[PDB]
Amino acid sequence: DEERFFPSNGILIFGKQNAARDNADYSDVMLTSEEEIKTTNPVATEEYGIVADNLQQQNTAPQIGTVNSQGALPGMVWQNRDVYLQGPIWAKIPHTDGNFHPSP
Amino acid sequence: LMGGFGLKHPPPQILIKNTPVPADPPTTFNQSKLNSFITQYSTGQVSVEIEWELQKENSKRWNPEIQYTSNYYKSTSVDFAVNTEGVYSEPRPIGTRYLTRNL
Amino acid sequence: LMGGFGLKHPPPQILIKNTPVPADPPTTFNQSKLNSFITQYSTGQVSVEIEWELQKENSKRWNPEIQYTSNYYKSTSVDFAVNTEGVYSEPRPIGTRYLTRNL
Numbered sequence A: 001d002e003e004r005f006f007p008s009n010g011i012l013i014f015g016k017q018n019a020a021r022d023n024a025d026y027s028d029v030m031l032t033s034e035e036e037i038k039t040t041n042p043v044a045t046e047e048y049g050i051v052a053d054n055l056q057q058q059n060t061a062p063q064i065g066t067v068n069s070q071g072a073l074p075g076m077v078w079q080n081r082d083v084y085l086q087g088p089i090w091a092k093i094p095h096t097d098g099n100f101h102p103s104p
Numbered sequence B, C: 001l002m003g004g005f006g007l008k009h010p011p012p013q014i015l016i017k018n019t020p021v022p023a024d025p026p027t028t029f030n031q032s033k034l035n036s037f038i039t040q041y042s043t044g045q046v047s048v049e050i051e052w053e054l055q056k057e058n059s060k061r062w063n064p065e066i067q068y069t070s071n072y073y074k075s076t077s078v079d080f081a082v083n084t085e086g087v088y089s090e091p092r093p094i095g096t097r098y099l100t101r102n103l
Helices: none
Strands: A013-015 A029-031 A049-052 A064-067
Touching: none
Parallel strands: none
Antiparallel strands: A013 A029, A049 A064
16 A cells, blocks of 8 residues: 555666656656565565564563564575566676575 | 585595504403503505696686786795705795686 | 797798779870879788697696786776777787796
8 A cells, every 4th residue: 555655776767758867857757666576575665574682581671673684594485576578688697606596 | 614615425534543552461360451552653654636627717808817926036935945944834825816707 | 039930931921902093094095104093092801810839838846936917906007908098008028938947
């Protein structure tokens, strides 16, 4: 129910025909939506979850921390960003010793 | 993490030991284990041959690349050589990454 | 003496020339040689392939040798590259003698 929200720099954006190169007006661009993956992926503008923060004892109340940056975790399963009729097709994987989930 | 190749089955551990040589035992039986041994040590040579596979460079880079090189000007002694005392010494650590490749 | 290989029979001289194209001559005969020509020049590509035989190094030297190398730190521009004007330039003369051999 929040189609009006989007990550400041977390989606692809195409311009409508003749949209100015700079400071193009919102009505002159087209924002993409990766809403389809709400099902397995974190929402881009919220925390991943909550972890403990201290060692609760009888004299100490339990505290928690918010996770805004979560790396690979045993058991995770995700989806990749969708592709668009006017979006890129492939990309060269950088020649490096290692990489994680090589999807552009 | 200290660098290198991770092997599930690496070169086996090679264990060596000097076989104990009892010094003359008592003249009448005794259950206790012998603790009196002849003193000795061993010495010999050991060889290790390793075959390494290289992966040649194939760059289309036009300009020169950075190469590891020996210092040009005079010095007290030679780098990676012996002393006047006969002591080999490794002046600096030498890396591996000199040639370049794109991403 | 300027350096190089002395050949009794070196790569032949390759001569090229634009064939003269007379401009319209006089309407009545004249013994004099034509001196009125159409103006023109030619252009094209040229290729040269050379096969060189190498003589690999076989040194038992233990320490590093002097190698030709590119400068390590930052610079206005890249050596043996083009300008901001598009002008290739050769920063220094590069020799041949880097590896060492005994006498």
